[model samples]
Target: LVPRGSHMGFPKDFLWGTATASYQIEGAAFEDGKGLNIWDVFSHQEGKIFENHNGDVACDHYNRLEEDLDILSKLGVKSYRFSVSWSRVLPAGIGQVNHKGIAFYQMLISGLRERGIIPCMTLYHWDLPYALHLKGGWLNDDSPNWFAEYAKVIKTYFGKEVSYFITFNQPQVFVGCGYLSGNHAPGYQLPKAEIVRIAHNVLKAHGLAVKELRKGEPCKIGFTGASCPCIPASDRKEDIEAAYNQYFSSNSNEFVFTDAFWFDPVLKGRYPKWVTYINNVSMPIITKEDMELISQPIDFVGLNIYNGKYVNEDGGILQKKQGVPRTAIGWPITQEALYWGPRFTSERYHKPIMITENGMSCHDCISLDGKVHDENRIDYMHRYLLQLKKAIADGVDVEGYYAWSLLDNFEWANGYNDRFGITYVDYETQQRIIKDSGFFYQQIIETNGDLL
Candidate 1:
């Protein structure tokens, strides 16, 4: 085997970080005047999550804030991306701010600052207030204004400190999976027609949030999407073209979403031509002013990519082979995801790229020596980063890469059955153990991937 000494590496200023969502990590479900969110309600339904498990205590991150911060400090983290729970702040989804709920984040950021780590805050990460759902949620035309008001609150409090703000994280996942597939919070399986209306309003909410962040304390803005792209089945030009075609303008998107549907209107102020071609689904009514509001130029485009679908010259998706590797949650192991995701996104949108979320779930456990060893995760990162290095070298304008998670907290619908963190969490004792992957990631950060 050839050595990696001749391989390309990341820029010295590249932001190496890890990610965690509030609902998934910050437990204290109903503590400190925090009102219930959709997940809080959905996960409690009988037989919803794996083994009917919910995130009642889920890592107890809110109660063990200092301990978790210390874990990040020990990992040599350069930056951290986390979301602020809406219901935690505006307990009823609107009106009345919970200072205690807000205090948790302030304390969290103070800890990050004390250790010299930069912070990027997300305003929403699929944890909509259940009160909002009862009042029609995203289907309500006033949803954009409501979200904008929340954005104003975020700016008034944290604007002076946090510079990077992601207005909304993975709208496609929340809107598509949350609405169409009904696997997530506020679960529902609606017709394609209703989903389009919800999607449109959510984009408006995103734009309004961006505007709020823009007018206050002066911060950079970005939007993260479930940007699972398509890779060419082969290196042939036709196959590559087919890959790009399917990625940008494929049909059946009413059920299966695309990054273009989520990213285009935000960046270009218009829907892609393919939207009208969707079977039995009509485009959501739009106004010229709506486009203007939705087209707010962003500082970066963050992608939450894990696996990629392969396409060939025939414009058909290639099937995964029988023995193909998969994560514990059944997601295929496709390391090429990062390479093509950032490449195609940057080439089309011409913006800085951030790998907002990238990591896999595994059946991790503590060993007899009280240490957790995750060599599989280590190998996964190794292969993925190699392709990412090649992407940057080939001119992808990538500025940051945040690993999917920092702790083995709640895995959402799957509950705690799957672990995806570089650090392990013992639910019974609340103990934290850094896996081998953590040590490996530390090296990647310290050397800026020069060892690649």
Candidate 2:
């Protein structure tokens, strides 16, 4: 058993939640007047995804939405963090709203409300409508308008009581993988100018969405960024400062890796001077009006942290040693990420931080007794939560935490090869078996981190 503490680290009102994406879980991609999404197209490409697996059938959560809601309520999470498939609701990305498609989401929110689960929604989770892609997607200057129109529809329909809203989830991943490395859906490799243009338009899309979300009900809004926590190599003061410096530094060339490349422009109302300068020359143009639009008032910083970089006393990143512990997908087991990632982010952004996504991928399966004994996942979460508790105790203003996924659905580019859910999913049978970690998390939520 892990060590326990008597004091409660999380407040009573803290949101303990589980997260999932629409495309990754909701498999009725072609039904209910739902149009095709980029994933529906990209995953169908012969060699893009693992074993050429697509989310066509997936977990069939679209049909089993109520069942999944039941599972979440059983886990006793205070909220459910989920993404809306733009393709599903706005089938053409901008024109007509598909009532059948949009009705499905309202049903989901209603079911969560019935179960007393708060609905935390993400407007975009990398599944852009295929129609949008056909029209140059994020590349088009009008893309932000497209997102704003979509956001207006969502807020007009579902924004009344859905208290928590995230405009985009890990823009770094989608913008980088989709436009730079060509690994994820809607894949492409492009010039730096075009890449920067896409990144700019994506942020503009976020800002416009925020404007729309704010028009109706008051809500907590966030823009989720990719976090690679720069961990101190040791307890030395210089090492800690070095880690801080590394954590907040901007990467101009590999710009999407920089959180401030996304966050600073949106939250700070100005692009970081360091980012635009290359050998004393400013890159891509940003108008003051664009800054005003991008810098809308935000409630919190949503960060998805999985891995971290260790920095030495000299402000240099430390290399991972050979044969270090790693997850099923080869991400290093670094619990400090939860602690320092929030610390640096909250300190810099000066906004309450929510761990929008954090969980491990384990090679898990149902055992002889028909149970998923994911002890590794439980241990991983326990250790990570301990770090989070420490960060909270240090007064980092972390308001909530959500596991990366509630169900083991489609694993994106890795396909179903990696399992990151506390709940085990039998893709073949659609069985929902709560893993040991799921039970552990239930206790954590029940005790408000006293079980840490």
Candidate 3:
């Protein structure tokens, strides 16, 4: 609720929704002709995920699709951003069609439509079919074409029903964790040069997917990026300018994380000028045609912002002072991140931006009264949404905002330890209960942010 004598509201047509990934929510890892993806392999390895927690039985949403959709519908959201399992559709990534997989999604799309929920589908959410990984995966030059083939199949069946399509979600997380850090699926500690090459291939796949998906009809197309925003240490002009400079400049790390490095080719049609500073590693080969394919006309940019770094004029990140608020997952609570993240991203990419994923994780559980009272999450959203409203007031074309998730599911490496969902899920009983945060969000949606 807003303070006395204050009222903040969103646009008339703002899209308020929640997001979830296939591997993280759908637990039918091997059911109904669905093939194994990288998460299926990595989560099974010794000491990979928290307590070796895997998504094999996570949420069981594959079988409880209708029930989950009902829960989502009650939230009063206008849209829902969910991922399509590549292996579910094409078990081999590029082979015979799995009619069962195709039918399942058709049912899902129809269900969402019936519930009046606009389905914003993501083409890939870090679930690479093991079959494709066996064949060099993102490293091979044919990866873009492979993704195009998958996109074709998706478009052939559900294209008319689903319009908003995201090519990939957090390519940097997939590339860095999967390749360089060896923390996520297909765990491998590769050299810096190989990592850069893999990143290039991922961008190529995004470009190709955009081309393939746009072939049939004019629909909104984009990709969700792990945008790490650099906030100015203070509100001074020099500090803000330095923050933007830092935001665009690539870090000196072997595995780059700059917005320009990941987004420049897609948005600007060229790599960042700071590419030559990588010390010993060779840059990936980029032909004129490659650049053309990577840069395609699209609708908007999707940024998954959780937090930001405080930057000063010296280009160094300032440490958060003690007692600063943070989420249960230890991410610093920076409400201004929503303000600067979209503002800087729109200024740089020149596209309408969406907060594809934004939410706080909390250690929550059902109390004696049989309800999960997650007031912390509500407080977190209140501050962040206020900052987001400020960004919109400042003239940033921030179109939509999708909360991180709808249900407490398997959180990648952290597994079930972190709960980012507004709805509380009894992992053992498979029962769903909407937390206080969920009700708060419901009010936010029903009033179109007027209540906030």
The stretch of ten residues in a row with the least summed lDDT in candidate 3 is: 1-10
Cα lDDT, all candidates: 0.86, 0.87, 0.87
Question: Against the true structure, candidate 2 has what lDDT?
Answer: 0.87
Measured over all alpha carbons after superposition, the RMSD of each candidate to the real structure, in angstroms, is 2.9, 3.0, 3.0
Candidate 3 lDDT tens digits, 91-162? 999978898888888988999999999999999999999999999998887988999999989888988999
Count residue pairs with overlapping backbones in model 2.
0
Report the lDDT of model 1 for residue 90: 94
| TM-score for each model | 0.96, 0.96, 0.96
As a TM-score, model 3 comes out at: 0.96
Distance from true location, Cα of 186 in model 3, Å: 1.0
Over 4 Å off, model 1: 1-8, 252-256, 274-284
Candidate 1: TM-score?
A: 0.96
- Segments in model 3 whose C-alpha atoms lie over 4 Å from true places: 1-9, 251-255, 276-283
